[PDB]
Design an enzyme around this catalytic site. Structure first.
Site, PDB file in Angstrom:
ATOM      1  N   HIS A  75      -7.008   5.939   1.278  1.00 29.30           N
ATOM      2  CA  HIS A  75      -6.409   5.440   0.044  1.00 29.30           C
ATOM      3  C   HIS A  75      -6.189   6.551  -0.924  1.00 29.30           C
ATOM      4  O   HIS A  75      -5.421   6.389  -1.882  1.00 29.30           O
ATOM      5  CB  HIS A  75      -7.151   4.260  -0.520  1.00 29.30           C
TER       6      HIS A  75
ATOM      7  N   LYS B  78      -0.255   4.204   4.252  1.00 32.89           N
ATOM      8  CA  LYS B  78      -0.430   3.846   2.848  1.00 32.89           C
ATOM      9  C   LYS B  78       0.506   4.734   2.042  1.00 32.89           C
ATOM     10  O   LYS B  78       1.715   4.583   2.154  1.00 32.89           O
ATOM     11  CB  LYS B  78      -1.919   3.870   2.441  1.00 32.89           C
TER      12      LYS B  78
ATOM     13  N   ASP C  17     -13.320   8.729   5.214  1.00 28.64           N
ATOM     14  CA  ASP C  17     -12.031   8.065   5.461  1.00 28.64           C
ATOM     15  C   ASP C  17     -11.284   8.065   4.153  1.00 28.64           C
ATOM     16  O   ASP C  17     -11.682   7.381   3.223  1.00 28.64           O
ATOM     17  CB  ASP C  17     -12.279   6.644   5.924  1.00 28.64           C
TER      18      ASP C  17
ATOM     19  N   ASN D  74       0.818  -1.214   0.000  1.00 26.11           N
ATOM     20  CA  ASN D  74       0.000   0.000   0.000  1.00 26.11           C
ATOM     21  C   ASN D  74       0.853   1.266   0.000  1.00 26.11           C
ATOM     22  O   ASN D  74       0.354   2.375   0.128  1.00 26.11           O
ATOM     23  CB  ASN D  74      -0.933   0.011   1.232  1.00 26.11           C
TER      24      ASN D  74
ATOM     25  N   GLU E 142     -15.794   6.351   1.970  1.00 26.13           N
ATOM     26  CA  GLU E 142     -14.338   6.437   1.782  1.00 26.13           C
ATOM     27  C   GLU E 142     -14.093   7.353   0.624  1.00 26.13           C
ATOM     28  O   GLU E 142     -14.965   7.490  -0.231  1.00 26.13           O
ATOM     29  CB  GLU E 142     -13.743   5.041   1.501  1.00 26.13           C
TER      30      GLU E 142
ATOM     31  N   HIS F  47     -14.760   0.132   4.691  1.00 26.90           N
ATOM     32  CA  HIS F  47     -13.726  -0.617   5.406  1.00 26.90           C
ATOM     33  C   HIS F  47     -14.144  -1.229   6.733  1.00 26.90           C
ATOM     34  O   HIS F  47     -14.865  -0.610   7.506  1.00 26.90           O
ATOM     35  CB  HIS F  47     -12.594   0.341   5.724  1.00 26.90           C
TER      36      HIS F  47
ATOM     37  N   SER G 244     -11.171   0.867  -0.497  1.00 28.22           N
ATOM     38  CA  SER G 244     -10.283  -0.229  -0.249  1.00 28.22           C
ATOM     39  C   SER G 244     -10.246  -1.353  -1.216  1.00 28.22           C
ATOM     40  O   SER G 244      -9.168  -1.788  -1.596  1.00 28.22           O
ATOM     41  CB  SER G 244     -10.609  -0.860   1.093  1.00 28.22           C
TER      42      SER G 244
END
Ligand SMILES: *C(F)(F)C/N=C/c1c(COP(=O)(O)O)cnc(C)c1O
Ligand SMILES: *C(F)(F)C/N=C/c1c(COP(=O)(O)O)cnc(C)c1O
Lengths: 383, 383
Positions: free
Chosen positions: A206, A235, A203, A46, A174, A132, A178
């Site tokens: 990523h 990440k 969130d 990641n 997100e 997630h 994910s």
């Protein structure tokens, strides 16, 4: 008895169901993966910007330890709030355009502290079905009411919110997802959430660091400021830990009520220096170079799969799921890639829809064009 | 609205009730505390063995970063399980006499993952009324039934356990307690828990490293092996993070079901090297020296307070609560100590029984006899 309960939760696992073993590596982050003394092109970490081995981040971690020692000594509410924690907080908030940031030891901890402190039994959490485990786990433990809306379905979210609720509604999603690396429609989501007097929690684990001017991530790219932004640093920042970004009053609220913040050991100050160094690289011209390179690698790969008998998800993030469909297919493929020196990881039922066996490939700005071409060459030759 | 709920949870706080601000420090761990450029004798950190600044621990953190970079890249169930994580796990398990250990990013995370994975709605948790926020918070979120037994009251625990329960009973307590630094009666506790077919979970955050042969902590000192031992490393180990110690089958169970373990980023391998270096110092002759010195400092302090108009709790750990009683008393005292260069922290209602305003003093093996004498001299002169 307890042992019967443990032996039976174990014994009653299906094989190609959900049994999982951990493989130790000498190197797991970035371009390469070293396992039992063999080097492999790593398509499973990641470390999206290749920052885990950056010399300025390493240097900050090392010199931090010389300046401050290692452990902080305790809590942020006692003697564990270092000048470095406070500079990092301030630097994050300024970067992302919030009033405050509060540091956490991990994203799970940050997502948990927020939900725990913020949601009551009368309240409702409306979360994307694919959120997630950390968001959902916490939302599910919460006394509040969890309702899951269909992935990215803003019409469904709208219905969920319009239902009579005795308290307040928190929407959670997100920035980059994910699983599939797709983005949420944040502008529209915010729009229905304001319509129903809810607040929004994103969130962006990523996306943070990896897209946006200066790497500011999904919200900033999409011109949305949710009420809670959670960013995590294991990440694209290439370290570990997390922050919640929020207003003065909510940060004050979280400092008073968030037990996970009140009573947990703060991160080593040296880790916090390494995080400031990583943020600096991310905001710099070197930052833009890495993000441009990762984008060119994504383009090269997506272009190369057009020719191949696999299907790609709707991602232009570092996450590139390669749909294979048949699990024996995926398994054989993954083991073939590995035998040819490309370390990939195969995701099959029940994790995802029967007939969706996929490789969850990741690329990073540490990779080079010839790595992508090797991966493509390998995907061609056997399949 | 949300803001009304936040503004009102805030606005409705009492003053000398529970409002809390964070003070930034240049140094917070060990003998000294540096705050706004002033040095103070630090009697408020959790660095019980003075290990946060140990040169071998620092060196391991630095060289780790050179060998492995910083971030691990991801999860332990993907490419974030490093050979260093596995050596540390193995070294912990061997040290403490268990079959397995699993690493966690913090104690909160470790306590949460265990409880979450292990307790179901049918189950019961019997926890000591004074158990740490992390244990209780998790136990309270759990779908299982929480019952709190009176502090260290094994007769009460017995009653709680003997009550009809539709599932399994987990007993939770601390090796050394957070608040008062007293020990639980582990041998007797285990005894009633086995009587009722329960299992025992001990959080030895405050004893680990600091008592016992080779520093093995409260359970080993007391000749008890509970089914779950949680140790955290931000106190006497002088770093940060945690481990759960347990059997083969339960570690296998936790690897399959513990989502917080499955989906969280593993700690930087360099942090794990620093943890192995700290464990090595702790198990060594240098280990025994530090523990002997901390014990002599505790003796010196307890002896010196006999003469003073304060009351000490029943602790022979690094934690030494000094009961002052009157809150204006405590406040004035704490501010006086600070003005005289001893950094202490005052704990008053509602945190503890009205008329129990105490200083929660901590000592470490980094302190010297003349520091204790200064603290004592200062406690005498004003009071
Ligand atoms: C990453 F993919 F390895 C683990 N996924 C973690 C994650 C978190 C958790 O934070 P952590 O810092 O790793 O404990 C929170 N949100 C998302 C979207 C992810 O993937
Ligand atoms: C310490 F006193 F600063 C914080 N107390 C923490 C604690 C934990 C939590 O682990 P952490 O690693 O700090 O997140 C678990 N058990 C106990 C008894 C304590 O004190």
């Amino acid at each position: 008895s307890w042992q019967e309960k443990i032996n039976a939760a174990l014994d009653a696992r299906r094989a190609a169901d959900a049994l999982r073993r951990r493989y130790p590596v000498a190197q797991g982050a970035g371009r390469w993966l070293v396992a039992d003394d063999r080097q492999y092109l790593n398509f499973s970490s990641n470390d999206y910007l290749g920052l885990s081995h950056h010399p300025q981040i390493i240097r900050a971690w090392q010199q931090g330890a010389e300046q401050f020692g290692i452990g902080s000594g305790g809590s942020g509410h006692v003697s564990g709030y270092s000048v470095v924690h406070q500079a990092l907080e301030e630097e994050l908030a300024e970067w992302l355009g919030y009033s405050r940031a509060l540091l956490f030891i991990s994203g799970f901890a940050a997502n948990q502290a927020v939900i725990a402190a913020m949601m009551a039994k009368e309240d409702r959490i409306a979360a994307d079905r694919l959120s997630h485990a950390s968001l959902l786990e916490a939302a599910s433990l919460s006394p509040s009411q969890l309702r899951r809306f269909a992935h990215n379905d803003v019409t469904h979210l709208a219905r969920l919110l319009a239902s009579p609720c005795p308290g307040q509604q928190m929407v959670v999603t997100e920035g980059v997802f994910s699983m599939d690396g797709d983005s949420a429609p944040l502008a529209e989501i915010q729009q229905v959430t304001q319509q129903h007097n809810g607040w929004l929690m994103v969130d962006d684990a990523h996306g943070t660091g990896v897209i946006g001017e200066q790497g500011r991530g999904s919200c900033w790219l999409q011109k949305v400021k949710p009420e809670l932004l959670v960013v995590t640093f294991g990440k694209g920042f290439g370290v570990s830990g997390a922050a919640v970004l929020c207003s003065s009053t909510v940060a004050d609220y979280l400092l008073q009520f968030a037990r996970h913040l009140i009573y947990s050991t703060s991160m080593p100050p040296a880790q916090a220096q390494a995080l400031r160094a990583s943020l600096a690289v991310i905001r710099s011209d070197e930052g833009d170079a890495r993000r441009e390179k990762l984008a060119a690698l994504i383009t090269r790969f997506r272009a190369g799969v057009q020719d191949l008998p696999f299907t790609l998800a709707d991602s232009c993030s570092a996450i590139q799921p390669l749909i294979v469909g048949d699990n024996s297919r995926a398994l054989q493929l993954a083991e073939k890639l590995r035998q040819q020196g490309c370390w990939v990881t195969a995701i099959r039922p029940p994790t995802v829809p029967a007939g969706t066996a996929r490789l969850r490939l990741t690329l990073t700005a540490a990779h080079e064009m010839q790595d992508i071409d090797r991966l493509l060459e390998v995907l061609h030759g056997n399949g």
